[PDB]
Amino acid sequence: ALFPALLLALLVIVATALTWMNFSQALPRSQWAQAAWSPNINVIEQMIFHYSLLPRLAISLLVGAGLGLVGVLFQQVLRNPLAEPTTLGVATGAQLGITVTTLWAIPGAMASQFAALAGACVVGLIVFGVAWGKRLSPVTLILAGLVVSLYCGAINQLLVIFHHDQLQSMFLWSTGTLTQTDWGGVERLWPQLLGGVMLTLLLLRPLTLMGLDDGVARNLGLALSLARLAALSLAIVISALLVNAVGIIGFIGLFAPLLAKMLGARRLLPRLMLASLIGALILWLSDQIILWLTRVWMEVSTGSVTALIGAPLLLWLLLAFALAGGVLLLMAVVVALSFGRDAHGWTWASGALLDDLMPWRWPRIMAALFAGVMLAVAGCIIQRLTGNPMASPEVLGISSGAAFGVVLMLFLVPGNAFGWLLPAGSLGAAVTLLIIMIAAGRGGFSPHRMLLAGMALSTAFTMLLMMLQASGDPRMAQVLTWISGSTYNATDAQVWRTGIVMVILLAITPLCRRWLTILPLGGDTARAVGMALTPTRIALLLLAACLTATATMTIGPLSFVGLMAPHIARMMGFRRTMPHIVISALVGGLLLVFADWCGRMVLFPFQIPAGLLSTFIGAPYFIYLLRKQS
Amino acid sequence: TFALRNISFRVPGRTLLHPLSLTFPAGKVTGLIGHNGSGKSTLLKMLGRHQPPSEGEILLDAQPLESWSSKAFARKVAYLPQQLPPAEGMTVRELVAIGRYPWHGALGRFGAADREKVEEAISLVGLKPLAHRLVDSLSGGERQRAWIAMLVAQDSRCLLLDEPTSALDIAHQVDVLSLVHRLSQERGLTVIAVLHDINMAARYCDYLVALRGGEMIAQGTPAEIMRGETLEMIYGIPMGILPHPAGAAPVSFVY
Amino acid sequence: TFALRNISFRVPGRTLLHPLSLTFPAGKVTGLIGHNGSGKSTLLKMLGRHQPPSEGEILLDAQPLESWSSKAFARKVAYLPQQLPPAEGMTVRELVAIGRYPWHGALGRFGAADREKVEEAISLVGLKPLAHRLVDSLSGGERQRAWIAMLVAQDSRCLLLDEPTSALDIAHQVDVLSLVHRLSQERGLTVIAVLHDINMAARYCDYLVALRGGEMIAQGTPAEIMRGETLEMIYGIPMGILPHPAGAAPVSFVY
Amino acid sequence: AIDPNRIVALEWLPVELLLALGIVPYGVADTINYRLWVSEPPLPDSVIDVGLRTEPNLELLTTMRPSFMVWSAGYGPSPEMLARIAPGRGFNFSDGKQPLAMARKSLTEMADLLNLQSAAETHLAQYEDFIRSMKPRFVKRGARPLLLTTLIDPRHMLVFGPNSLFQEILDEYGIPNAWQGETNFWGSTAVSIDRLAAYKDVDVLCFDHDNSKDMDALMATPLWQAMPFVRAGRFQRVPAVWFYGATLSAMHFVRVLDNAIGGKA
């Protein structure tokens, strides 16, 4: 226990030294007591911005404590060791509120209200289901949370694609600058945070039971449904207040409870207090480093830097055949309609107009189909080799790594970094992709730690994208479409090449049928059967990585279809390797073809990327399937 | 003091499903035996209120049929999960203290008494150290004994054990059965235990009942039921029985 | 048949270390009996290459060291691990095609050439006319038979099983032990089975090995194992032994 | 292009150049946001909207017969997909130092391509005359630094750096820029409010575009009231102009500066 205590003492002394240095550079020490304690500070300019420098420290400490609290609560309620407030949709709902109240007037505390609304809607959809009883479970809870998070993310993406010049403020709000100009934020957060800690001190034994198994929790007589609903509502409310105070953060509440448990604290309230203190300390460190940076070079955000410095720390501390023929015929006829049907007056290509519009339709639809099929196969393979329902193509780090490379290229060099000879562009994206894949493979030996590293790298990519969008970069829109997975740059030659790659990969796939069959229900039994665990697990990971690589090379970094097609194929009633594979592939292909046709035709002038329409079509049907089997 | 009338376990088809009706003793030891979960599991799962009674009524000490307050319910019965051992825990003392949940409630007034009961529990189970390091660091027997200590501190009128004998050693089975029998003699509470081994139920239970699929075969005292001609129709294998000077109940051996 | 000369143990887990020395018979049943944390489970996990030993090494076949290829190891050893079990197989009758992996391999399998092996396996494990018409969620009696189906389809030279008798009834355990003994008598197979029950294991064994504390206690035939001193030393409780009226192994009874 | 009536533009800066030349645009990508932001050059209502600036609808383009599909070099579709529909050219506009220079260069290029050199010469002459006309209106103020800001939220502000589009106007008028810190290649940086406290004798000019409530929430705080540039009477609100424009946006900015600080000292 010497190492955690020594690290904590080092963090405290570094925070104190940085705060002393910043406060002395801002104001001489001989005028500190006259500036802090006096409610009517002197009119001196050097002494009056202490009205803004002091609230930044207080808001940082309070938000760190709140982050630790919500991390502990999300760890206990969902019974998962990892906290995930953003995946629950509280951050995305708050962003949606900010972007819908930034336009059409109607202002106020939009983040908290809309995040609470999203939480209440999720609670209602889970309690409803198909039976009078709620029958809520953590797995379906997290699934629905991810679904609504992706849905609000897609609505926000549509709103910024149609209006990006008028949401720059929102961009800053999505970076967590926590820059304060008065005491209003602290005076509004401290009473609500006091109410939060008061409600946390109460109902502690329900939290202890929620941390244990649900069986003994219902045995002890705790209303598991009502208690879990109330705890989730409290967590969503506190997270909404925090993201209304500062905004999107670098998951300090994901390091606070783990450090508090590594240091010690067997009981619950000591662990809560230590987690809050450690979160406040991390936010203090990050805020002081950001202040020093803006004093010496560039005004960068706080949450993005927090995530960028926490990622390496986390890496260091780490009927079938008939249904198939039916969906294939459906895809064939729907491709025929998308070729024939148009949007300029809803005309139909009767022949002569077909070859004139074919060079702008056939490549796009074919690329969307190939990308959907390949993403569905990759997602199914990942969920089969891992076994977790939350597994997505982003788990590898392929899409997040490629986008990281593109945004790094846009940051390092100015100008048209997409097609410039001096700029790397595709080559830079590819080399950063390979580097990110190698790092994710070397960091996590087990699929679960690899999943954690992939989620961390995805959050880091999101933070870098929000950094790129916060600044007035004229290119932030262009790459945005590429982030949204648009089939607009598809070419006949690229279509031919990705089709050849797809048929090669789908011919290699049946050779992995035995592996994809034994790895399920495996572990030690798989090794006892006669197959090598790691030499085949790395092989399947490389196959899925190549699939995702060509998918992002075709359509771009999107993984909603790759996450949804396996789930929908499993909920249809297909649970055999090759049947599930082909069904998920065909479902994803038809879904992405429908999404492309919608994004190209539902609005004739404005073309929305297919990645947004994929979500817009999959989310309602998926929540319908979830309620039908809840 | 429980009287069960189970016409249907569940609408969807189970391996075997048949109606039955029986009254449990007031202060004796009840031993439910059967072939795995083929009808035997549903009985105690429905008693634990994890399974709907379909078209049958269950008298809670002659109070009502169903839909009773969960607080008094947990204060009345103490149920053990059926081959679902809790994999979470930190301290044995923390566990046996949190076992006293349904007495003080969520906003519990634990700052007063309730310490003598947890002390008596941790002294009865045989654990000399009051608070160990980690409830998961101990062996399986010790953590299961801590679970029994939690169920003791719960202060229940009925003790439902769903297969405590399973995944345990024979000597551990004997020790746990003797402890449960001495506990039932001490507190005068009804205990219903699920036992895979017939001899184990013959040893430390005063009223054995058997369901071969769910038709209610035989109920009786070990002296009343003749195992020789009964276990042959109970489990199929024509095993024999012979007296032993160790226990008053003659031991059964596979033929 | 492989033999062990290793000294290592579960040093990091529960802090235990003790030297081991044992040579298994050529083609006889080997019953591992003792406590749960006695070391028999860790011994079988060491035998199945679940984790590399820290000291010593297990010599196999008398001609090679521990370093063996996966398809060559599984071609001579079939491991029933019980713990971390294959849950939700989602397919029936195809499990024998999964077990046949080390024979046909991934390439050149020809969709399982010579299908006489799989049908012989599913017919000798049990006369079932319901093949390719089952679901994954069934009772233990058929689940264990489906488990041993692929192990028989492997026709590996050794069968290492830990706790087949667990979660099963006396009839199903009788069936499983009779199948194992018939396999060992017909194919001359070397089987090492872990069973908690002393008498049930001894009735279908020949060379029992008892583990207590950290080391091994005995290694004799069931006739010499039935002695009361050995049972007292390996189980703690004092039990007695008396000749069986018709069973080959005498009956042991707890006091 | 022989017919100037069917010219199509894919970015707002080509539209501004076309309106400066006097050519009537036939199709503009994203015209609603254009009419919302840019307001100095009146865009007609009969202009057919093509779609997004980054993803112009190709089927709508091929439906009509465009004679020249001018676009911004490095923004929009690939050059081959645009040359497959109609012959055109990608014009450079931004580099990180002199945006207005290359704006004028691309204007002259568009003139030489569409055979409109006389219109471009007349437009540049009128621009230079309008610039020289407002020269004595900014000489009596002296060498006091001017600060170009815009409100993002009641906590930050977007400040124009030494490489903005309004820097050639400031340099020609002998007006040094007040911001002398960090800067990006497009001429805008998001800084904090308290950082502006480091500037004493500066003439902060802030633009407004649907942010009156944020302005009130900012000026209601005592920290903003105690700022050095407001206590000396140097902060005034002026109508917003288009930052990333060309010559017409420059004329609008010059007129705004003349109505603001023109003839103060």
Author numbering:
A (entry chain B): 6 to 323, 348 to 659
B (entry chain U), C (entry chain C): 11 to 265
D (entry chain D): 32 to 296
List passages from the publication reporting this PDB structure.
As one of the most elegant biological processes developed in bacteria, the siderophore-mediated iron uptake demands the action of specific ATP-binding cassette (ABC) importers. In the periplasm, a group of soluble proteins named periplasmic substrate-binding proteins (SBP) are generally responsible for binding the siderophore-Fe3+ molecules and delivering them to corresponding inner membrane importers. In this study, we functionally characterized the ferrichrome, a hydroxamate-type siderophore molecule, importer FhuCDB complex from E. coli and determined its structure at 3.4 Å resolution by single-particle cryo-electron microscopy (cryo-EM).
To understand the molecular basis of this importer, we determined the structure of FhuCDB in LMNG by single-particle cryo-EM at 3.4 Å resolution. The overall size of the complex was ~130 × 100 × 80 Å3, with one FhuD on the periplasmic side, one FhuB in the membrane, and two FhuC on the cytosolic side. However, a unique feature in FhuCDB was the single membrane subunit of FhuB, comparing to two subunits of homodimers in other known subfamily members. FhuB had 20 transmembrane helices (TM) folding into two domains: N-half with the first ten TMs and C-half with the last ten TMs. In between the two halves, there was a central translocation pathway. Based on a tunnel calculation using the MoleOnline server, the FhuB central pathway was open to the cytosolic side and closed to the periplasmic side, indicating an inward-open conformation. The movement of these residues effectively deformed the original substrate-binding pocket in FhuD and allowed it to be occupied by two loops from FhuB: L5 in between TM5 and H5a as well as L15 in between TM15 and H15a. In FhuCDB, three residues in L5 (F167, D170, Q171) were directly interacting with FhuD residues (N64, W68) via hydrogen bonding. Specifically, these four residues: V165, F176 on the N-half and their counterparts Q498, L509 on the C-half, defined the narrowest position in the pathway, which was then directly closed on top by H169 and M505. Below the periplasmic gate, residues along the path could be grouped into three types: hydrophobic residues with mostly small side chains (A96, G150, L151, L155, G158, A159, L494, I512), polar residues (T91, T92, T97, Q100, S154, N161, Q162, S179, S421, E423, S487, T488, T491, S513) capable of forming hydrogen bonds, as well as Met residues (M175, M495, M492, M484).
